Amino acid sequence: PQITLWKRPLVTIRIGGQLKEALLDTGADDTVLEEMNLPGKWKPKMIGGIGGFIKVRQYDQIPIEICGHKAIGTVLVGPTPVNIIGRNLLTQIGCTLNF
Amino acid sequence: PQITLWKRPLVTIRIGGQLKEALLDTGADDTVLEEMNLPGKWKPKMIGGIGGFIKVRQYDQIPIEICGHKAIGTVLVGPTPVNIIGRNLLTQIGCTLNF
Numbered sequence: 212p213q214i215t216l217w218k219r220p221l222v223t224i225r226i227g228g229q230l231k232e233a234l235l236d237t238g239a240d241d242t243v244l245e246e247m248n249l250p251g252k253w254k255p256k257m258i259g260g261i262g263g264f265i266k267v268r269q270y271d272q273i274p275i276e277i278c279g280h281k282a283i284g285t286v287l288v289g290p291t292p293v294n295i296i297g298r299n300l301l302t303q304i305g306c307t308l309n310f
Numbered sequence: 311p312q313i314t315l316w317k318r319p320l321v322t323i324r325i326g327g328q329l330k331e332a333l334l335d336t337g338a339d340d341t342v343l344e345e346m347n348l349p350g351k352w353k354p355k356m357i358g359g360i361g362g363f364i365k366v367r368q369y370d371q372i373p374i375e376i377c378g379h380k381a382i383g384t385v386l387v388g389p390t391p392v393n394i395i396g397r398n399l400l401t402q403i404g405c406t407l408n409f
């Protein structure tokens with residue numbers, strides 16, 4: 212689709228058989244999801260945002276269907292204000308900015 | 311233009327003197343710029359993201375040129391690590407997400 216920006220670009224994602232709303236966030240290098248259970252090994256990591264640093268759990272090679280488009284990549288789980296889809300997965304679904 | 315997301319979507323903006331590099335950020339509701347001493351009235355505000363909140367000064371009706379496109383609107387100013395062009399101005403320069 213083409214998504215305009217008068218409203219937040221929120222879309223439905225499917226991860227681990229669950230449906231969630233997430234924000235298409237071109238300002239995010241990484242994909243960061245609110246606290247949830249994902250299977251498999253994870254690694255403790257830290258990331259910084261506008262307000263400072265948080266601790267996250269890094270899950271590698273996780274499938275997510277974003278608005279009908281398949282991605283398989285790194286997902287960070289931690290205390291983000293909202294689920295964000297960052298550039299690591301936006302590139303996989305062929306997302307660009309246009310003006 | 312079309313901007314892929316392999317790299318951070320940084321572009322040149324102008325606000326007065328001062329050309330700056332800023333992120334075209336679909337995840338930011340409002341534009342937030344690094345500390346700078348703008349003229350005019352303003353109001354304090356707190357904006358939240360990963361890590362928590364920062365305090366900013368909200369200036370209204372500030373003209374900004376973004377990649378040669380004219381925009382005018384709210385510009386938040388505070389201790390952000392990166393200059394961020396948010397949705398309030400992205401719509402003004404005709405910017406969409408496409409995939």
Ligand SMILES: CC[C@H](C)CN(C[C@@H](O)[C@H](Cc1ccccc1)NC(=O)O[C@H]1CO[C@H]2OCC[C@H]21)S(=O)(=O)c1ccc(N)cc1
Binds near residue numbers: 262337342
């Ligand atoms: C609530 C949604 C989202 C977290 C809001 N943020 C915009 C976001 O694009 C920031 C923009 C941002 C970029 C870089 C530093 C700080 C902020 N990115 C971000 O936090 O990304 C993190 C995930 O990947 C990593 O890559 C960048 C930092 C990490 S924000 O910076 O906090 C923000 C919040 C409110 C306004 N008005 C403007 C900006």
